[PDB]
Amino acid sequence: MKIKTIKRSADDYVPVKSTQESQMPRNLNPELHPFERAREYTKALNATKLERMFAKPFVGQLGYGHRDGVYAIAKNYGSLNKLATGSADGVIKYWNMSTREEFVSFKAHYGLVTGLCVTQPRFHDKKPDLKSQNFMLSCSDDKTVKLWSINVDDYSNKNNEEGLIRTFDGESAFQGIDSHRENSTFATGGAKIHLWDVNRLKPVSDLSWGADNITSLKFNQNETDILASTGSDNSIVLYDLRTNSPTQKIVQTMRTNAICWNPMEAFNFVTANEDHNAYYYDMRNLSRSLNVFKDHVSAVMDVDFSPTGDEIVTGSYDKSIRIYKTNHGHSREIYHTKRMQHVFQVKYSMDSKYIISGSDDGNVRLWRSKAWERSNVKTTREKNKLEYDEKLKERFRHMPEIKRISRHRHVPQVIKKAQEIKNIELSSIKRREANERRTRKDMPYISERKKQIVGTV
């Protein structure tokens, strides 16, 4: 008659010391954890109600702001702290976003500035220091491109030439700039895009697919010799430097304000178009855009590809800024405040977390990417749960109680009536198509990725 009963022994489960934490023995039998699906639902439902509670996107602004309005923002891709903004007054300023003050302010041009880019030069005579100085390059209305040195307080290794190394004079009014990361190279946007050497006062090669004005540029990050060039004649012409030649053309329905190459994939480029939509292509096949992004109500003025390579952040002539992933085709998040108007320029951070945003109102407002990600470095207990929420929020993303909560944002009232108009307008145009669909026999249905292309070369 062998008898054994349950013995807890009281010494394992309650510690001997006072300072020792209680041990916490676990049994993973599903019979003792009964509500599998219901709990992790309402953990995700608390996860969205918390992430709509910790929706604190705004983090400050950089200094006291400009005077006429930020039309151009460049980023040192080397240095994480810094950027440069140029107002429409002609004044460029170089920022330390950590201190949120100016390094130095420069009365650069008598006209508008049109674009900034930054690249440390590689002179044939000497080397300008990467570490002790940083270098801004500007692009003006008044036929003018000017180099700028900056005294920088980063490295304490040392202890002249505070500004304006040399000026590059041209023939036509300059529209935009971008530099090429290999061997001291930058092209300008104007009536003629023409490539520049840093050491040469006059341009090396004049490039044009046609004799038309060209309004903005950006080099790609990898396969560096490939250039992309916009056009006010509602066009895009890509360039290749190693053939010293333009390479192909695509003509959209409305003009393209700015583009941006992705850094990570390096053969896809997103563009910002003046019809209230933004488009994303492949360089190989400009017959089909890879996505459209139908979220805005007015013209997008600038897009920037995240260095993550997932997200694309855009700013419009509507007083609002959208963030969308490459996948979903729609903005996951809209940013707006009353104190910004008509954002002309927007650039994603280089550590991929904080979104900078130039405006017409003259301030440089900088935001966060996700509204919940914090500057805190988090402990191992908080990190796992904050990971555990953002994974559990994904498989329960489609529950209609969640998707009601995970989506909706307070957009301002002047924007929300415009989307109400397009819902009236597209449902009218779908009626204007479906009636003509029933008359004619076999009408080709051009897909929405394709309808924004007139033709190519």
């Binding site: 008659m1 008898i3 013995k7 676990r26």
Partner: protein, 438 residues
């Protein structure tokens, strides 16, 4: 396997990921520190049910032998025992006036309320701290000190009273037919349900599912849910009325005991009775299911236990005695009979192996080796739980409460798709082809 190069790298990822965590669940099978208590006959002459409590309390450990109790409280009426769901705090109610919220292992006493109204049953609602008796007319809500917190105007008869802990949802069903669920976090009564069947004779929750099972004078054990005002499914368990019911912790198995000297073993997953104990000599007033799967029965002065009654074979059919020592016939596991008592309820202690029996003179705990589960999960329910570890877990369950609308018959169907909307995803092509049919 559908033709998709993008999805099959994702979908075969998930199916292989599902295989990795499930086989790693049995990795923690080794990490179980303790194993369930057992009983052996060791002979052919020695029967497993002849062993009395005076033979158990000698051969078993000193700590558990002191954890068997003889609370003899002879002057007030026949007591109703509810332990909390962690094994610690016992709650008892006299039929005349005791309500004692004892701590049980140690000898402390939280609250002792003498109520001159009659009292039928009580449970702890959300901790050891807040309990809820079923008075003469009005279910009250008490505190750990003996304070009243609420006189519930509603719940106007309460014979059978139960809580279910993932919804914060106190449930009553009295001698009025109605079935009321009181969400005790907000205080807002969720759902009042007309049972239509008369005075509720027996009620016990389903732990896996949070549906509940009433029992009527028809003999129709009725499954309920706060969303639908009809019973989810009716089950003619036994003839006559239903004295008590109990439901296995897995949710698979049910045991009813009608007043027709009968006893049923139901399978709640497929609604088919396994086998029916007929003509037990005096009708079982109470049953309870253990955590390991051990059955209990109360003829009124008797307490009878069976092992492996809840399985599906015909050999699992519980019987009072084997002719000739037949192994296919299932003898009772452990029996005990009181002297001159009539028991009222009986509940196992959750995380030890005793069963708390409430009889007319007082309280015993009978020591049963195979009863309780030996290794709990300390995130869920701590037997060993300090003040700070409790009141942080009191808030954690409140932020993670479940809505009453979540109570369905399958727990897994809260994430699924509507059965009306189609299985296949719709194309924009296929939605426009429906207009051709229109």
């Amino acid at each position: 396997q559908t033709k998709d190069k993008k999805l099959r790298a994702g979908l075969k990822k998930i199916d292989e990921q599902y295989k990795k965590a499930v086989s790693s669940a049995a990795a923690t099978d080794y990490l179980l520190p303790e194993s369930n208590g057992y009983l052996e006959p060791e002979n052919e002459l020695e029967k497993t049910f002849k062993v009395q409590q005076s033979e158990i309390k000698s051969s078993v450990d000193v700590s558990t032998a002191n954890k068997a109790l003889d609370l003899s409280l002879k002057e007030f009426g026949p007591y109703h025992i509810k332990y909390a769901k962690n094994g610690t705090h016992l709650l008892i109610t006299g039929r005349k006036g005791h309500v004692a919220s004892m701590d049980w292992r140690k000898g402390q006493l939280r609250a002792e309320l003498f109520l001159n109204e009659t009292c039928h049953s009580a449970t702890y609602l959300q901790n050891e701290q807040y309990f809820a008796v079923a008075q003469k007319k009005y279910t009250f809500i008490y505190d750990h000190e003996g304070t009243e917190l609420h006189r519930l105007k509603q719940h106007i008869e309460a014979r059978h009273l139960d809580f279910l802990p993932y919804h914060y949802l106190l449930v009553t069903a009295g001698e009025t037919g109605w079935l009321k669920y009181h969400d005790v976090s907000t205080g807002q009564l969720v759902s009042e349900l007309r049972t239509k069947a008369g005075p509720t004779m027996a009620m016990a929750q389903n732990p896996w599912n949070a549906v509940m099972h009433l029992g009527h004078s028809n003999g129709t054990v009725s499954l309920w849910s706060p969303s639908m005002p009809e019973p989810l499914v009716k089950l003619l368990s036994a003839r006559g009325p239903v004295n008590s019911i109990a439901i296995d912790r897995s949710g698979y198995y049910m045991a009813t005991t009608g007043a027709d000297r009968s006893m049923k073993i139901w399978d709640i997953r497929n609604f088919k009775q396994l086998h029916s104990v007929e003509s037990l000599p005096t009708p079982g007033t109470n049953v309870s299911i253990s955590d390991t799967g051990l059955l209990a029965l109360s003829r009124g002065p008797h307490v009878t236990l069976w092992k492996d009654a809840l399985k599906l074979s015909g050999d699992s059919k519980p019987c009072f005695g084997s002719m000739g020592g037949n192994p296919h016939r299932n003898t009772p596991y452990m029996s005990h009979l009181f002297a001159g008592n009539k028991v009222e309820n009986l509940g196992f202690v959750p995380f030890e192996d005793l069963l708390g029996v409430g009889h007319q003179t007082g309280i015993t705990n009978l020591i049963v080796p195979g009863a309780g589960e030996a290794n709990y999960d300390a995130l869920e329910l701590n037997p060993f739980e300090t003040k700070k570890q409790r009141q942080e877990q009191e808030v954690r369950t409140l932020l993670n409460k479940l809505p009453a609308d979540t109570i369905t018959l399958d727990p897994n169907s809260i994430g699924s798709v509507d059965k009306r909307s189609s299985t296949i995803r719709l194309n924009a092509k296929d939605l426009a082809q429906t207009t051709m049919d229109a």
